[PDB]
From Swiss-Prot, chains A, B:
Disulfide bonds join C10-C87, C13-C119, C15-C22, C27-C36, C49-C69, C59-C65, C83-C101. PROSITE patterns: LYSOZYME_I. This is Invertebrate-type lysozyme. It comes from Ruditapes philippinarum. Substrate binds at K42, Q43, P44, Y45, W46, I47, D48, Y73, Y81, H94, N95, G96, K108. Keywords: Antibiotic, Antimicrobial, Bacteriolytic enzyme, Disulfide bond, Glycoprotein, Glycosidase, Hydrolase, Secreted, Signal. Optimum pH is 4-5 at 40 degrees Celsius for chitinase activity. One of its GO terms (molecular function) is protein homodimerization activity. It comes from the Eukaryota. GO terms for cellular component: extracellular region.
Length: 123, 123
């Protein structure tokens, strides 16, 4: 995956959770909007992460572009919103948005992520 | 698995997700609570499902007892809270509690369950 603050092990866990084993699955409807690809990235997220690649959907289905987006989203928001800079923090940002790490709701996502084999207590 | 409203296919899918391939893995602390066994049953859940078997942890590590608990939990709550009585409803109850089927947070769990081999479109 693309380098950055989110660890390779953390990204792999997130990818396995979002797309069912880390696969370029395209877009699925959830909470009234489409989430796409390896990391199930929504359109506003892709806009915020600096619009990497050709476009939202093609980026989402590319392991390098989609992970670059995740890295850049965390660079933008996990820092600004003073999240813990670890997999739990990043996972909660990914699921909850710019201040997801401070929303109790995102703990269910972190719980689920750790059910993925090899992902218990990932940093 | 134990008989009841939750289909055998649904239970297998839930079991595979919860314990990394449906195994009596005992208890783990994710997010500040101990969850145990095949279906990663927490203690209040086991109390609510009618305390089947000898105790919480032994029940949780037993394929019949733990699935009996799931069945009885749904009999208690999925009915009362007017959930859809299908794998989606039951999976979301399991993930989110008595009214989990009406919480958006439990959707990620349902989305992941469906991506387990054999589990696409499970009812
Ligand atoms: C992987 C993924 O798509 N995750 C989803 C989250 O992105 C989403 O949270 C929402 O994210 C957007 C995009 O970052 C947030 O909008 C931004 O908010 C910041 C801070 O207020 C603002 O400065 C930006 O202008 C704005 N960007 C745009 C393009 O509008 C939005 O606030 C987040 N929503 C919430 C409720 O926190 C969540 C929730 O929809 O879902 C994830 O799946
Ligand atoms: C498999 C598993 O352990 N699932 C977890 C859920 O059980 C848990 O949700 C919480 O479940 C408990 C037990 O059913 C809920 O407490 C019950 O609430 C009902 C209705 O309010 C009440 O009648 C019962 O007396 C009460 N039981 C006890 C023993 O207190 C509790 O409210 C649920 N919590 C929430 C937030 O809804 C969720 C929590 O996220 O985790 C699952 O893993
Ligand atoms: O599957 C049957 C269930 O469907 C739901 O849409 C209803 O709200 C429940 O009351 C009903 O028991
Ligand atoms: O509503 C749930 C039910 O759906 C039916 O279509 C299936 O045949 C049952 O196995 C399942 O329990
Ligand atoms: Pt849609
Ligand atoms: Pt749609
Ligand atoms: Pt949004
Ligand atoms: Pt917090
Ligand atoms: Pt929770
Ligand atoms: Pt503990
Ligand atoms: Pt609880
Ligand atoms: Pt509780």
């Amino acid at each position: 995956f693309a380098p950055g603050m989110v660890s390779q092990k953390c990204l792999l866990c997130m990818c396995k959770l979002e797309s069912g084993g880390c696969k370029p699955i395209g877009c699925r409807m959830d909470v009234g909007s489409l989430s796409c690809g390896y990391f199930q990235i929504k359109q506003p997220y892709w806009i915020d992460c600096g619009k990497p690649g050709k476009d939202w959907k093609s980026c989402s289905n590319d392991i390098n572009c989609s992970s670059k987006c995740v890295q850049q989203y965390m660079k933008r928001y996990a820092t600004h919103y003073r999240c813990p800079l670890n997999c739990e923090g990043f996972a909660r940002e990914h699921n909850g948005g710019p201040n997801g790490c401070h929303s109790s709701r995102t703990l269910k996502y972190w719980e689920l992520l750790q059910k993925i084999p090899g992902c218990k207590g990932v940093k």
